[PDB]
Amino acid sequence: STGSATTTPIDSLDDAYITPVQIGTPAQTLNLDFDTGSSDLWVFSSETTASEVDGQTIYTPSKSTTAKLLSGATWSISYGDGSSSSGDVYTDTVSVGGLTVTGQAVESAKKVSSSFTEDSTIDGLLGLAFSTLNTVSPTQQKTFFDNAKASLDSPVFTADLGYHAPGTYNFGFIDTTAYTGSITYTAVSTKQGFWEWTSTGYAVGSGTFKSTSIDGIADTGTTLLYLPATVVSAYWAQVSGAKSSSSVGGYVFPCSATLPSFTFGVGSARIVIPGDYIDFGPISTGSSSCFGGIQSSAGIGINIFGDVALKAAFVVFNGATTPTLGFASK
Numbered sequence: 001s002t003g004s005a006t007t008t009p010i011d012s013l014d015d016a017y018i019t020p021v022q023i024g025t026p027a028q029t030l031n032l033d034f035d036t037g038s039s040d041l042w043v044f045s046s047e048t049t050a051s052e053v054d055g056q057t058i059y060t061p062s063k064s065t066t067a068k069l070l071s072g073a074t075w076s077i078s079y080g081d082g083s084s085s086s087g088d089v090y091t092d093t094v095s096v097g098g099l100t101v102t103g104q105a106v107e108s109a110k111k112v113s114s115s116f117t118e119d120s121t122i123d124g125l126l127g128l129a130f131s132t133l134n135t136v137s138p139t140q141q142k143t144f145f146d147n148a149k150a151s152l153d154s155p156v157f158t159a160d161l162g163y164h165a166p167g168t169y170n171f172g173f174i175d176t177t178a179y180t181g182s183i184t185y186t187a188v189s190t191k192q193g194f195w196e197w198t199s200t201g202y203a204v205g206s207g208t209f210k211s212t213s214i215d216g217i218a219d220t221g222t223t224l225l226y227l228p229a230t231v232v233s234a235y236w237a238q239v240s241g242a243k244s245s246s247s248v249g250g251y252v253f254p255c256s257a258t259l260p261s262f263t264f265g266v267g268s269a270r271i272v273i274p275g276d277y278i279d280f281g282p283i284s285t286g287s288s289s290c291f292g293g294i295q296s297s298a299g300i301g302i303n304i305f306g307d308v309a310l311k312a313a314f315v316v317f318n319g320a321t322t323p324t325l326g327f328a329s330k
């Protein structure tokens with residue numbers, strides 16, 4: 001089997017991407033944030049504290065003839081941005097782009113933190129990291145991909161995120177029309193539960209490539225590119241007036257700037273992030289200070305190849321017995 005679904009930016013800055021997902025019978029379609037940095041499929045629901053729902057579409061398990069309470073199971077998750085959610089668990093039929101999994105754990109939120117409430121466009125998350133990170137207790141549950149994998153034509157999914165435009169998540173096949181040149185594959189460590197790999201270095205603009213190992217994660221659920229402070233300083237030093245602002249919470253730059261590109265290495269291959277991809281717009285409405293899309297990972301404890309990086313590539317998440325990652329230009 002295969003599936004193919006369009007993923008759409010939630011706003012004009014590509015702050016996140018949503019993908020429609022069918023849950024239950026009859027189908028309830030929710031727009032979920034596909035997150036290769038986490039491993040829980042959770043949704044706003046009829047069980048979510050009413051004051052914490054503000055415009056989201058909810059899953060109502062009592063209206064699904066295939067929903068079954070997973071008795072005794074609870075979940076609770078916190079993310080790197082400080083947001084969180086928790087609740088109980090159903091199993092139900094879940095389909096993405098024509099690919100159907102029966103008995104998928106659908107984690108129903110009883111509580112969500114303020115940032116989730118405040119974002120009306122995201123109805124939940126669909127985790128695509130390794131199932132070892134799944135938070136369901138006392139019986140850990142599998143991701144949608146983990147459940148689907150054996151049925152797929154090939155045990156892979158691909159992320160093809162757009163810049164200020166829709167893109168595609170495919171399951172079970174590689175669309176050879178969706179990228180240019182060849183896909184370069186690189187080793188993955190699953191030891192921390194992530195799609196963790198080692199970039200071979202970077203360049204800023206038209207500058208020379210610096211060969212250096214940068215261990216990080218391919219994370220569709222993180223908006224920005226988080227790299228070591230040395231690398232980030234080298235980038236922003238090429239933008240007149242750019243500075244790290246403790247009050248804003250990262251590097252900012254004059255909105256009048258033309259940003260240089262940023263290149264990262266995948267083996268001997270190179271992925272070029274155009275400068276425009278690194279502009280996250282005014283820090284507050286009407287400001288001439290703009291927020292940067294490349295930020296320091298110092299104090300995160302891990303480098304994160306988030307959407308800023310991934311949207312410059314066609315990315316293969318290869319879930320074979322020994323997982324790997326593939327990157328192509330597009």
Ligand SMILES: C[C@H]1CC[C@H](NC(=O)Cn2ccnc2)CC1
Pocket residue numbers: 035037038079080081082083125221222223226300
């Ligand atoms: C320092 C960084 C700050 C931004 C963080 N972004 C997230 O946590 C986004 N997220 C929510 C759910 N899955 C992903 C990542 C760490």
